[PDB]
Amino acid sequence: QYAPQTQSGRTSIVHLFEWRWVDIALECERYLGPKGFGGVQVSPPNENVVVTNPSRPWWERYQPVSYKLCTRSGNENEFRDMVTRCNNVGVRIYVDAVINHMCGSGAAAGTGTTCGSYCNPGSREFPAVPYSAWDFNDGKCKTASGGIESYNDPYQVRDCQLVGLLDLALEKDYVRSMIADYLNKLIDIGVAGFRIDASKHMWPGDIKAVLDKLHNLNTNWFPAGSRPFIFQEVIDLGGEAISSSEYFGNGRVTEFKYGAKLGTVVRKWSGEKMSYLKNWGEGWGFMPSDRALVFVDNHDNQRGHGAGGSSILTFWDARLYKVAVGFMLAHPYGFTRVMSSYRWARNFVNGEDVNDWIGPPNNNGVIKEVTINADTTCGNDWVCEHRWREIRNMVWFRNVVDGQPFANWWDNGSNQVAFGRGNRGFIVFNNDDWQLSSTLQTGLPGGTYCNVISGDKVGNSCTGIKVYVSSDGTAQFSISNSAQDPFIAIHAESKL
Ligand SMILES: C[C@H]1O[C@H](O[C@H]2[C@H](O)[C@@H](O)[C@@H](O[C@@H]3C(CO)=C[C@H](N[C@H]4[C@H](O)[C@@H](O)[C@@H](O[C@H]5[C@H](O)[C@@H](O)[C@@H](O[C@H]6[C@H](O)[C@@H](O)[C@H](O)O[C@@H]6CO)O[C@@H]5CO)O[C@@H]4C)[C@H](O)[C@H]3O)O[C@@H]2CO)[C@H](O)[C@@H](O)[C@@H]1N
Ligand SMILES: OC[C@H]1O[C@@H](O[C@H]2[C@H](O)[C@@H](O)[C@@H](O)O[C@@H]2CO)[C@H](O)[C@@H](O)[C@@H]1O
Ligand SMILES: OC[C@H]1O[C@H](O[C@H]2[C@H](O)[C@@H](O)[C@@H](O)O[C@@H]2CO)[C@H](O)[C@@H](O)[C@@H]1O
Ligand SMILES: OC[C@H]1O[C@@H](O)[C@H](O)[C@@H](O)[C@@H]1O
Ligand SMILES: [Ca+2]
Ligand SMILES: [Cl-]
Numbered sequence: 001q002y003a004p005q006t007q008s009g010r011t012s013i014v015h016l017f018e019w020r021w022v023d024i025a026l027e028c029e030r031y032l033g034p035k036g037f038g039g040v041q042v043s044p045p046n047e048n049v050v051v052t053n054p055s056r057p058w059w060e061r062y063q064p065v066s067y068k069l070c071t072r073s074g075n076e077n078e079f080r081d082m083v084t085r086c087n088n089v090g091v092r093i094y095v096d097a098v099i100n101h102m103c104g105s106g107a108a109a110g111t112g113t114t115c116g117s118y119c120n121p122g123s124r125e126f127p128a129v130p131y132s133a134w135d136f137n138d139g140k141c142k143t144a145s146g147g148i149e150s151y152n153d154p155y156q157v158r159d160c161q162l163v164g165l166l167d168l169a170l171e172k173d174y175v176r177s178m179i180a181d182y183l184n185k186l187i188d189i190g191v192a193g194f195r196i197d198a199s200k201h202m203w204p205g206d207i208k209a210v211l212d213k214l215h216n217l218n219t220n221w222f223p224a225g226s227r228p229f230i231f232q233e234v235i236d237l238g239g240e241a242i243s244s245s246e247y248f249g250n251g252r253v254t255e256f257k258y259g260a261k262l263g264t265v266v267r268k269w270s271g272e273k274m275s276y277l278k279n280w281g282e283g284w285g286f287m288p289s290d291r292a293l294v295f296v297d298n299h300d301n302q303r304g305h306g307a308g309g310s311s312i313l314t315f316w317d318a319r320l321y322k323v324a325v326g327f328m329l330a331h332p333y334g335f336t337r338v339m340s341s342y343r344w345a346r347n348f349v350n351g352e353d354v355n356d357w358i359g360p361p362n363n364n365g366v367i368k369e370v371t372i373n374a375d376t377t378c379g380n381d382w383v384c385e386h387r388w389r390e391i392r393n394m395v396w397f398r399n400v401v402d403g404q405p406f407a408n409w410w411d412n413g414s415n416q417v418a419f420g421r422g423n424r425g426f427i428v429f430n431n432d433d434w435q436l437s438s439t440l441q442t443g444l445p446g447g448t449y450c451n452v453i454s455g456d457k458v459g460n461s462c463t464g465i466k467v468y469v470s471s472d473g474t475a476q477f478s479i480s481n482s483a484q485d486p487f488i489a490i491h492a493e494s495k496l
Contacts, residue, residue, distance in 0.1 A: 001211070001230040001251035002290060004335055005192045005222060007090035010038030011398045012329070014338045014386045017299050018043050018058060018360035021074035023370040025082040030372075033089030035392055036399050040086065041094045041195055041337065045069045045079055046182065047115040047128070049103040056365050057357035058299070062197065063103035063165065066128030067182040070115035072360075072367050083190040087221045092192035094229065099179045099210070100198040101165035102126055121166060135175050137167040152241045162201050170206035180213035187215045192222070193229030199253075200234045204246050207232070211250060231293040231335075235307045238285065248291050255292040255334060256307050257285070262296060263311035266324045266431065268415065274431050275411035281333040294334035296324045302341060303356045315341055315383050319485070322390045323429060326453070326487055329394035330419070330427045332406050336398065338391060343381045390485055393452035400491045401425040408443045412436075418477070420444070425491035430479035437478045442490075446471040449490035457494045466496075 004013070014037055016024050024040055032040065044061045047068045051060040061071065069076040083093050102121070109120035117128035124133040141160035143149045148160045161167050168175050183194065196207060217226040230251030236244040237257055244253045261284060265272040281289060300306030302314040313321045328336060344358040361368040361381040371379035378384035385391055404422025411417040415431035420443040430436035448468050450457040455464020467490050469475040479486055 001227055003227075004038060004092070004229045005217065005226060006038030006092050009399050009402065010036055010090065011402055012037060012336045012338055012395050013039045013041055013092075013094060014340050015041040015299065016340050018061075018342060018367065019073065019340075019370065019382075020367050021078040021082040025078075025085040027370070028082075028086035028089050028091045031387070032086070032091045036396055037091060037338075037386070039092030039094055039192060041096060043071075043073060044096050044098050044197075045071060045073065045186075046098065047071060047113055047117055049107050049119070050112045050114060052112075054357045056359045056362070058359040059357065060359075062098055063107070064098050064101070065103055065113045065119045065126060066115065066117045067178070067185075068115050068117065068128065072114060072365075080189055087190050093190065094193045094195060094231075095183075095186050095191050096197055097183060097194040098197045099168070099182075100170075100201045101162065101167050102131065103166060104164045105161065105166050106164060124166060129178055131168070131175075131178070135169050135172065137169050140169070141167070154241050157242060158201060158203050162198060167201075170202055170210075173209075176206070176210050176213070180210050183210070184213070184215050187228055188218060190218045190221060191228070192217060193231070196230060196232040196250075199232035199247055199250075200236075200242055204250060207247070207250050237307055244287050248287075252291055252293045252335065253287060254298075255287055255294050258292070258294045258328075258334070259296050259298075259301070259312055260308045262324050262327065263308065263313045266313060266320050266327075267311060268431070269311060274415040274417045274429065275413055277327070277417060278409055278411065280331055286333070289333050292334035293337060294328060295337040295339065296321065296328055297339055298337075299339075299341075302339065303344075304353055305356070315339075315385055316346075321385075322388065322453075322485060323431065323487055325385075325391055326394050326427065326489065327429065329391075329398045330401075330421070330425070330489065332404075332421065338386050338395065340386045341383045343383055389456065390453050393456065394489065396493075397425055397427075397452060397489055397491050400493050408441050410440055412438075423492075425489070427487065427489040428477045428479065429487040430481060430483070431486060433481050435478070435480055437476070439474055439476045442469055442473050442475050444469050444473055444475075444490070444492075446473070448496045450494040450496065451488045451490055452494050453485050453487055453489050457496065460496060462494075462496070 047066045048061045049063045069079045107121045119126050137159045148156050232247050233254050235256045297314045301308040301312045313324045346353045347355040368380040401421035401424040404424045408420040418428035420426035426442040450462030451465035
């Protein structure tokens with residue numbers, strides 16, 4: 001459960017948020033595979049309720065009505081096709097598994113669902129599964145509201161309703177079996193693992209009971225006896241009742257402290273300096289590296305939901321976002337997940353984005369295709385961060401330095417820092433309000449390297465900055481505080 005199961009050498013996963021199956025299949029073949037991306041985290045592939053108020057929010061996909069592979073992203077055939085095509089080119093598929101609950105208890109009875117299945121949340125009836133009243137935690141929850149009133153009571157968090165979503169009775173084998181049946185179908189199709197949604201809202205033991213029923217991965221692409229990769233979403237910034245460690249036995253866990261702290265440091269808020277990053281990782285009180293799934297931002301906190309708050313860096317702050325993503329992809333700690341979003345019309349009212357519900361780019365509710373521009377960027381409002389040179393080149397950096405130890409750290413005692421990975425790569429940042437012009441030990445063998453942030457190595461030349469490294473591994477780095485991208489990165493494979 002801790003091994004990502006990505007093709008050997010591929011070290012990252014990308015969240016292709018709200019993308020359609022057919023577009024992901026293409027993206028795997030034309031880009032993800034050739035560019036060395038390890039896998040894709042897809043949006044919930046199971047049938048969900050249709051929300052008309054607001055008009056088709058991105059969050060309606062977190063309100064299940066059945067386990068049929070039929071959504072705005074595509075049908076089962078398109079899903080199967082995607083998994084096969086991606087697997088064939090070395091890119092794994094990870095499913096976002098929504099298993100803690102069904103749809104909102106207040107939703108109306110009917111067939112207003114993505115596949116036309118009938119449900120009646122008032123009477124707790126989901127015929128398409130099937131589930132009925134006895135499969136929910138209603139009589140178990142001890143709060144007046146029937147919802148989670150305090151996160152300091154581990155019982156409410158697990159047994160009560162999260163934002164009014166019908167809570168499944170996970171201690172029951174019937175429920176556990178319906179869930180494992182759904183997951184097993186995906187595994188057999190070829191899925192490599194799952195993001196367990198709202199893991200904090202389930203007892204570690206119930207998740208375990210479900211996981212023990214899972215099939216080994218499909219031998220057409222994975223070795224015999226391979227177990228699916230599991231990463232549980234557990235938000236724990238410290239100082240709360242439930243702790244991330246409670247879920248270590250099930251697989252990896254989301255380290256939300258990572259993005260919250262890194263955002264504050266890169267933004268330079270609360271007296272934080274980049275030089276404080278020397279002991280980044282466990283030194284900052286993070287979970288064990290082999291238990292963590294790390295990221296700068298996720299689908300929730302990039303729009304105000306979840307944890308992190310204003311310190312979270314998103315594509316909206318492109319310049320600082322790339323620095324943060326660059327630092328994450330260069331540092332040895334944890335398994336990395338790169339975010340890929342869509343643009344929406346933000347509207348702050350009282351410091352709150354009232355438009356945070358807006359779903360993916362669409363033509364009257366139908367998701368738009370992902371178009372690729374001549375310069376390799378995307379159209380139709382898909383941001384495609386994974387295609388920005390600075391990010392795609394750092395994904396490659398991580399593959400190249402894989403296994404190399406953190407080495408040759410340097411800092412100007414303020415916001416200029418640098419470090420390398422063994423003798424395979426080196427990165428330097430200037431987040432200060434002044435010039436960086438120093439000769440640093442890179443730990444790399446002499447030669448001329450192409451800076452992968454400002455350009456690429458094309459043939460026998462660099463398209464951006466070139467860095468001449470001498471025989472003793474020393475080189476000069478000049479970075480202006482006004483540079484478009486205030487950082488430089490070079491590695492074994494950008495050497496001329
Ligand atoms: C019926 C309802 O429908 C809608 O609800 C939406 C919801 O708005 C969407 O966000 C989305 O939710 C997804 C879900 C639910 O399926 C789960 C995922 N993320 C959620 C977490 O799993 C859940 O734990 C919760 O996080 C808590 C956190 O647990 C808690 O600690 C606290 O965090 C603190 C932190 O501890 C503290 O140290 C720091 O200082 O501050 C933090 C902020 O307080 O609070 C967070 C947030 O409450 O919530 C996560 C969102 C998944 O990633 C989500 O996408 O889908 C649902 C269903 O459609 C409507 O919006 C709602 O109004 C309806 N009633
Ligand atoms: O060591 C565990 C704590 O690390 C903290 O990180 C930083 C701190 O924020 C900086 O101001 C500086 O002092 O270095 C620390 C790490 O050496 C973290 O913020 C705390 O929450 C952790 O408990
Ligand atoms: O590879 C495509 C494109 O990526 C980068 O462009 C980004 C830019 O860096 C971000 O700051 C933001 O503005 O989005 C841009 C478009 O996606 C490279 O800078 C650019 O040269 C390159 O063509
Ligand atoms: O003095 C330091 C400098 O020495 C020269 O020999 C090297 O070529 C430079 O890259 C190095 O930074
Ligand atoms: Ca629960
Ligand atoms: Cl997540």
